[PDB]
Amino acid sequence: LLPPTEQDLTKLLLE
Amino acid sequence: ESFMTKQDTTGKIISIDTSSLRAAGRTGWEDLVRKCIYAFFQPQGREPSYARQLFQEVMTRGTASSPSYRFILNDGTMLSAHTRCKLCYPFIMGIHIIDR
């Protein structure tokens, strides 16, 4: 299991 | 006060629903999600993180639940949250309740 990076979360929150 | 995630069956978060947080009238909510998640994935002293423990449990038996974990907003406000997740039919629905 791999934690999300700050860019990943940016992705998610834009969608 | 809460928000929701779905993860695929490798653990990658594939979406977040911030609806109820956005309906809640407080600023700061982006920092809040960002912080709560990172806490959720933080190792626990020497035991694995709550996110690793729940992911192993939910995949083996379709439900898992974490104790409370604390995290700190940009202005040093201290919060706590806990997570419950279920395997749905294929994906992991998680909810994160903020005890304030």
Residue numbers in the entry:
A (entry chain B): 794 to 808
B (entry chain A): 260 to 348, 356 to 366
Article, verbatim:
STAT6 becomes activated in response to IL-4 and IL-13 and mediates most of the gene expression regulated by these cytokines. By direct interaction with specific parts of its transactivation domain, STAT6 recruits the co-activators p300/CBP and NCoA1 (also called steroid receptor coactivator-1, SRC-1), which are essential for transcriptional activation. In particular, the interaction between STAT6 and NCoA1 is modulated by a short region of the transactivation domain that includes the motif LXXLL (where L is leucine and X is any amino acid). Here, we report the structural characterization of the complex between a STAT6-derived peptide encompassing the region from Gly783 to Gly814 and the NCoA1 PAS-B domain257–385 using NMR and X-ray crystallography.
In this crystal structure the residues located in the N-terminal part (Gly783 - Pro793) are not ordered indicating that this region is too dynamic to be resolved in the crystal. Nevertheless, the new X-ray structure of the complex clarifies the structural role of Leu794 whose side chain fits into a deep pocket on the cofactor surface formed by Phe314, Phe300 and Ala310. Yet, there is no interaction visible between the residues N-terminal of Leu794 in the crystal structure. Therefore, we decided to perform a structural characterization of the NCoA1257–385/STAT6783–814 complex by NMR. Importantly, the interaction between the NCoA1 PAS-B domain and STAT6783–814 is further stabilized by the interaction of STAT6 Leu794 with a shallow hydrophobic indentation constituted by the PAS-B domain residues Phe314, Phe300 and Ala310, seen also in the X-ray structure and in agreement with the alanine scanning mutagenesis data where F794A reduced the affinity about 50-fold. In addition, the two isoleucine residues (Ile786, Ile790) located in the N-terminal part of the STAT6 peptide bind into a shallow hydrophobic pocket on the surface of the PAS-B domain formed by Phe314, Met318, Leu346, Pro356 and Ile358. The NMR structure of the NCoA1257–385/STAT6783–814 complex indicates that the coactivator recognition mechanism by STAT6 occurs by the formation of a partially ordered complex in which two α-helical regions (Ile786-Ile790 and Glu799-Glu808) are connected by a linker that adopts an extended, albeit dynamic, conformation. This dynamics in the linker may act more strongly onto the N-terminal region of the STAT6783–814 peptide that has fewer interactions with the NcoA1 PAS-B domain than the C-terminal region, ultimately rendering residues 783–793 disordered in the X-ray structure. Thus despite the invisibility of the peptide N-terminal to Leu794 in the X-ray structure, the complex formation between the NCoA1 PAS-B domain and STAT6783–814 is well defined by specific interactions in solution.
